[PDB]
């Protein structure tokens, strides 16, 4: 599957180590290499299980 | 799966680095090469998890 | 899967570069070659995620 | 999957290049060869995504 | 999948070229050979996408 | 899949050429050989797409 | 899949040729050999498509 | 899949030839060897198609 | 030897699985394959041992 | 042995598929190929077991 | 065995294709080649099963 | 060449042994096997030499 | 070519040695074996050269 | 040569087994395989020998 | 081609040495062996060149 | 030989599956592949046997 | 054989794809490659079967 | 066969590309190479189908 | 075939390059070499299609 | 080099044999195969040597 | 060399088959493959020979 991360503030880090500014949206698929995704800062995540808001 | 990006303003960048003008719609499938999609600017994205609005 | 594009005005371009007149409907499947579809002009798209209206 | 095209007027062209008269119904499956189907004229199409009316 | 055709009048042609009389029902599966089914005359078709009435 | 045919009158023919009397029920699976099933006479058929009544 | 036949009267024949008495229940799976099941007499059948009552 | 048989009385026979006393529950999966299960006596069966009561 | 079956009503089954309508007469010889003949419905049988009337 | 069929009306069919007119008599022996003889229409049959009248 | 045909009128045809005039008698044995004998016209046949009169 | 036989009454025999009902028309070509055609009953024959009426 | 012989009376002999009854019509082609045809009795012959009446 | 069959009513059978509706015209050539053509129902046939009307 | 000789009196000789009685008709084809045909007595000959009357 | 089809109305189908509009004329020769030609709709056909009008 | 097409107006298309102006005449023979000739526009065709006028 | 073209005015082109002056006559046979003949200008053509006048 | 050219004036050229004086007649057959014949001057030509007068 | 042909009227022929309608423009380069270009009808040609107007 | 086509209206076709909308400009070079360029619709072309306006 895949996750959808909308960065609600600048400098949101996404560690597979990408960085997003405010208003961007990263749609990330899971690979063999990427087995865990850690999200820092204020962001809005949509997964298959629902939505969540990281701070 | 695939995502649907409607560009609501000109010069929306979609990084696999394509560019869209206002009113166009890009339907993008995920491949081996494209494991992450970053969307800049004002756009309206529909995924399997729902809809979202990048700015 | 596949998408359904109803061209609501003449000269709608669909880039895999086909062109549609007003009232036609193109049902397009995704292949290995076609990994992204860009739709210009005024058209009405139905996907699995729902409907959308390109301008 | 497959699509269902009911030709609501005579001479409806379906390009894989078959022709239908008024009142006939063509149920078409997707193959390796048929990756895109274009429908001309007035017809009523049922897909998995719903129904649509080509003109 | 498969389709269900109830012939509501005599002489309904089903082209894979079978003929049905009034009241019969043909349940037809899709094979490699049968990639398209055209139905003439007055008949009542049930597919996975729903029902339709050919004339 | 499979279909369920309840013969509502005597002498119902099912062509793969079996015959059913009134009140019997034949549950028929699709094989490589059986690609089409034609039902004559008055019978009540349940498929995955729903129910239908052949006459 | 599989079917569930509850014999509501004695001597119910199930042809793959088994016989059931009143009150017994036979749960039958489909194999390569068993491609069609014919049920005689008064019995109550549950399939994936629903329930039915053979007489 | 699998079936769930609750024996509501003593000496319930389950033929693949196991015997159950009153109050026990046998959860039985289908194998290559077990293609048909016959249940005698008073028992309460849950399948994927629903519940039924053998007598 | 051989048997003579006059079908006195429609749909008489003769299992070696042939079907006879009312008024027809089947004269059947015994082969290596046909070692037993079962007659259903109302029919009038003449054998070497005499006549009999199946119902 | 052999059977004697006197056709009492026109168009009597004898299936081994010969046809007889009214007043003709066919005396038919049993061979390896002909193991069963079915008689349609109105005819008068004499066998070793006696006489019979097909209708 | 053998049959005895007395031709009671001229031009009686006997198909194994011999022709008899009035008053002649043909005694015919059954061979491998002659497995069925058809008699036209007015004739009087004696077999082992008795006598009969073809017209 | 070929002949055209219109059967003006039922049970018209055409020996190459086909049978025709009233109103049917058989157009028969000559082959190596079919060197002579005999027509019984009431029929209307058109050949290259003209027409004729068999009775 | 071929000849058309309508037998106007019973027992008409045609020697290539076939026999015709009254009202039948034999259409005979010429082969390597059949180099001459002799017609006895009352019959009506159509050839390419015209018609003739044998007695 | 070839024949021309105009079907004057629905469901006209042409056996070489094709079926024609009312108003259609089949022009059929003779091959090695097709040595005889039988026409059922009401139809209007033109051959080299002239025209005829099957019923 | 072929000739048609109707013998108008008894004992008409046809030398290829056949003999005809009064009323018979011989239709004779030309072969390699038969290069000349001489007709004696009273007879009526039809050829492709017309008719003639030998005496 | 060959046939001449003048399409008197739009959408006339000619099955060897070509389509003609109103006023066009198709002159079709017979090949090994094309052994039968079926004409639908209103058209005016000239053959060697004459003219005919399909509807 | 061959056909004669007189183009009565400009731009008459002849598909084997040649084009004719008003007043020209094309005499076309049939080859192995050219098995069907379609004529558009207003033209005057002479064949062996007669004349016709395409529009 | 062959065609006869009388050039009624100067500079008549005949494309197989020959040119004729006024009063000359070209008699042209059809070969393997010449499968179609186009005639320009004012000329008078005689074919087997009749005469025609190109302009 | 062959053509007949009567030279009605002196010096008539016939190109296969022969010359004719007034009153002579040349009867010319078509060969492999002579595929076209051009006639100059005043002459009177008879072909199979009829007569014509070159000037 | 190359030439520019603007077709000022319909049906302008350009022989290398292409056809142009009114208002179209063909820009044609010279190849090894195309050593001469002939222009019919009313057209406006621009070359390196200047412009010209064909009629 | 190369040509410059400014599309002055929508849907201008350029056949080497590309399509241009109003206001776009295509600068096209000549290759081995592209030896001729045909321009439809209203467009403004600049070549080395000057400018021209296709309609
Ligand atoms: Au950062
Ligand atoms: Au376009
Ligand atoms: Au039919
Ligand atoms: Au039993
Ligand atoms: Au039956
Ligand atoms: Au006889
Ligand atoms: Au018959
Ligand atoms: Au003699
Ligand atoms: Au069509
Ligand atoms: Au010239
Ligand atoms: Au043209």
Out of F30, F45, F48, name the one closest to residue E25 (CB): F45
- B27 close to A16: Cβ distance less than 8 angstroms: no
CA dihedral T10, T16, T17, T19 (to 10 degrees): -20
Q: Rounded to whole angstroms, how far apart are CA atoms I39 and E4?
A: 35
How many Å lie between the alpha carbon of I10 and the closest alpha carbon of chain J? 12
- Q40 close to Q18: Cβ distance less than 8 angstroms: no
Q: Count CB neighbours of J43 within 10 A.
A: 25
How many Å lie between the alpha carbon of C15 and the closest alpha carbon of chain D? 13
Contact partners, residue I10, CB within 8 Å, separation at least 6? F10, F11, I21, I22
CA R20 – ligand 3 centroid, Å: 58
> How far are the Cα atoms of E48, E54, S17 from residue D1, in angstroms, in the given order?
9, 20, 74
Q: Which two tokens stand for residue M4?
A: 């058309």
CA dihedral O43, O46, O51, O53 (to 10 degrees): -10
DSSP state of E49: T
Among Q1, Q3, Q4, the residue to mutate for chain R (most R Cβ within 10 A): Q4
Sign of the torsion formed by the C-alpha atoms of G14, G19, G23 and G26 = negative
B11: left (phi over 0), alpha (psi -120 to 50) or beta: left
**Chain S contacts of R51, Cβ < 8 Å?**
49-50
Beta bridge partners of E5: E26, E45
Q: Rounded to whole angstroms, how far apart are CA atoms G16 and G37?
A: 5
> How far are the Cα atoms of N9, N38, P54 from residue N23, in angstroms, in the given order?
7, 19, 6
How many Å lie between the alpha carbon of F44 and the closest alpha carbon of chain G? 10
CA E52 – ligand 3 centroid, Å: 22
H34 alpha carbon, distance to own chain's centre: 13
CA O11 – ligand 8 centroid, Å: 5
- Placement of tokens 């005015």 in the chain: R9
Angle of CA points T38, T40, T41, to nearest 5°: 160
Question: Is E24–F54 a contact, with Cβ atoms under 8 angstroms apart?
Answer: yes
Q: Which two tokens stand for residue I6?
A: 């006059």
- Placement of tokens 């002009």 in the chain: C41
Question: Is L46–N54 a contact, with Cβ atoms under 8 angstroms apart?
Answer: no
Identify the nearest ligand to the CA of I40 by its number. 5
- P21 close to P6: Cβ distance less than 8 angstroms: no
- Please count the helices (runs of H) and the strands (runs of E) in chain M: 0, 7
Residue by residue, DSSP assigns M15-38 as: E--EEE-TT-EEEEE--SS--EEE
Q: Rounded to whole angstroms, how far apart are CA atoms R45 and R39?
A: 9
Comparing CA positions, the residue from J5, J19, J20 lying closest to residue J52 is: J5
Q: Rounded to whole angstroms, how far apart are CA atoms C24 and C17?
A: 16
Out of P36, P49, P50, name the one closest to residue N26 (CB): P36
Strands (E), chain S: 2-7, 12-15, 18-20, 25-29, 36-39, 43-47, 50-54
Interface of J with L (CB under 8 A): 10-11, 18-19, 21
Q: Which two tokens stand for residue A35?
A: 């087995």
CA U18 – ligand 2 centroid, Å: 8
Q: Rounded to whole angstroms, how far apart are CA atoms M53 and N17?
A: 41
Out of I4, I31, I51, name the one closest to residue J35 (CB): I31
Q: Rounded to whole angstroms, how far apart are CA atoms S29 and K18?
A: 62
Q: Which two tokens stand for residue N49?
A: 């020998």
CA U21 – ligand 3 centroid, Å: 51
Question: Is J24–K54 a contact, with Cβ atoms under 8 angstroms apart?
Answer: yes
**Chain I contacts of F10, Cβ < 8 Å?**
10-11
- R18 close to R26: Cβ distance less than 8 angstroms: yes
Angle of CA points E19, E22, E24, to nearest 5°: 70
How many Å lie between the alpha carbon of N52 and the closest alpha carbon of chain L? 8
CA atoms within 13 A on the CB side of Q43: 28
Contact partners, residue T15, CB within 8 Å, separation at least 6? T37, T38, T39, T40
Contact partners, residue H27, CB within 8 Å, separation at least 6? H2, H3, H4, H5
Out of N24, N31, N46, name the one closest to residue P49 (CB): N46
CA G15 – ligand 3 centroid, Å: 34
Tell me if there are at least 3 CB pairs under 8 Å linking chains M and E: no
Q: Rounded to whole angstroms, how far apart are CA atoms I36 and B54?
A: 79
Q: Which two tokens stand for residue N14?
A: 């042409």
Residue by residue, DSSP assigns chain U as: -EEEEEESSS-EEEE--EEE-TT-EEEEE--SS--EEEE-SSEEEEETTEEEEE-
Q: Rounded to whole angstroms, how far apart are CA atoms S54 and R26?
A: 10
CA F16 – ligand 3 centroid, Å: 19
Beta strands at T25-29 and F2-7: parallel, antiparallel or unpaired = unpaired
**Chain C contacts of D4, Cβ < 8 Å?**
none
Residues in chain U preceding a C-to-N separation beyond 2.5 angstroms (breaks): 16
Residue by residue, DSSP assigns D1-55 as: -EEEEEE-SS-EEEE--EEE-TT-EEEEE--SS--EEEE-SSEEEEETTEEEEE-
Q: Please classify residue S44 by burial: count the beta carbons closer than 10 Å to its beta carbon, then call 0-12 exposed, 13-18 middle and 19+ buried.
A: middle
Structural resolution in Å: 3.7
The distance in angstroms from the start CA to the end CA of chain Q is 23
Question: What is the number of residues in chain S?
Answer: 55
What does R_g of chain J's alpha carbons equal in angstroms? 10
Residues in chain R preceding a C-to-N separation beyond 2.5 angstroms (breaks): 16
O51: left (phi over 0), alpha (psi -120 to 50) or beta: beta
- E21 close to E55: Cβ distance less than 8 angstroms: no
CA M10 – ligand 6 centroid, Å: 8
- B3 close to B47: Cβ distance less than 8 angstroms: yes
- E49 close to D49: Cβ distance less than 8 angstroms: no
- M9 close to M22: Cβ distance less than 8 angstroms: yes
Tell me if there are at least 3 CB pairs under 8 Å linking chains E and F: yes
Residue O9: phi, psi to the nearest 5? -150, 165
Q: Rounded to whole angstroms, how far apart are CA atoms A13 and H35?
A: 55
Among P1, P5, P17, P24, the residue to mutate for chain Q (most Q Cβ within 10 A): P24
What b-and-e string marks burial along P1-28, b requiring 16 or more CB atoms within 10 Å of the CB?
ebbbbbbbeebbbbeeeebbeebbbbbb
Comparing CA positions, the residue from P3, P1, P2, P6 lying closest to residue P53 is: P6
- M40 close to M20: Cβ distance less than 8 angstroms: no
- Placement of tokens 């996408």 in the chain: E49
Contact partners, residue Q47, CB within 8 Å, separation at least 6? P2, P4, P27, P46, Q1, Q3, Q4, R49
- Which three-class secondary structure state does DSSP give residue M11? coil
Question: Is G25–H1 a contact, with Cβ atoms under 8 angstroms apart?
Answer: no
HEC letters along N25-54: EEEEECCCCCCEEEECCCEEEEECCEEEEE
Q: Which two tokens stand for residue M16?
A: 């290539």
DSSP state of O49: T
DSSP state of M42: S
Comparing CA positions, the residue from R32, R25, R17 lying closest to residue S47 is: R25
F15: left (phi over 0), alpha (psi -120 to 50) or beta: beta
Q: Rounded to whole angstroms, how far apart are CA atoms M38 and B32?
A: 89
Residue of I nearest to J29 (CA): I29
DSSP state of P42: S
DSSP state of H9: S
DSSP state of F31: -
- Placement of tokens 């036979």 in the chain: G26
**Chain N contacts of P48, Cβ < 8 Å?**
2, 48
The strands making up U2-7's β-sheet, listed across from edge to edge, are U25-29, U2-7, U43-47, U50-54
> How far are the Cα atoms of C4, H18, N4 from residue C49, in angstroms, in the given order?
12, 51, 56
Comparing CA positions, the residue from P48, P41, P46 lying closest to residue P19 is: P41
- Please count the helices (runs of H) and the strands (runs of E) in chain T: 0, 7
User: Which residues have beta carbons under 5 A from ligand 4 (an ion)?
Assistant: G 11, 19
Sign of the torsion formed by the C-alpha atoms of J6, J11, J13 and J14 = positive
- Which three-class secondary structure state does DSSP give residue B44? strand
Q: Which long-range contacts (CB under 8 A, 24 or more apart) does Q11-20 make?
A: Q11/Q41, Q11/T10, Q11/T11, Q12/Q39, Q12/Q40, Q12/Q41, Q12/Q42, Q12/Q43, Q13/Q38, Q13/Q39, Q13/Q40, Q13/Q41, Q14/Q38, Q14/Q39, Q14/Q40, Q15/Q39, Q15/Q40, Q18/R36, Q18/R38, Q19/T11, Q19/T13, Q19/T19, Q20/R38
Residues in chain S preceding a C-to-N separation beyond 2.5 angstroms (breaks): 16
Q: Rounded to whole angstroms, how far apart are CA atoms T11 and R20?
A: 24
Beta bridge partners of K28: K3
Q: Rounded to whole angstroms, how far apart are CA atoms H38 and G26?
A: 4
Q: Rounded to whole angstroms, how far apart are CA atoms J47 and S40?
A: 94
CA atoms within 13 A on the CB side of R10: 0
How many Å lie between the alpha carbon of Q31 and the closest alpha carbon of chain T? 21
- Placement of tokens 């509807």 in the chain: P55
**Chain C contacts of D38, Cβ < 8 Å?**
18, 20, 24-27
Beta strands at F12-15 and F36-39: parallel, antiparallel or unpaired = antiparallel
- E38 close to E50: Cβ distance less than 8 angstroms: no
- F4 close to F42: Cβ distance less than 8 angstroms: no
- T42 close to T55: Cβ distance less than 8 angstroms: yes
């Amino acid at each position: 599957d895949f996750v959808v991360i909308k960065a609600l503030e600048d400098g949101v880090n996404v560690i597979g180590s990408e960085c997003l500014d405010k208003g961007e949206v990263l749609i990330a698929q899971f690979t063999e290499h990427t087995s865990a995704i850690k999200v820092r800062g204020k962001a809005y995540i949509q997964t298959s299980h629902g939505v969540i808001e990281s701070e």
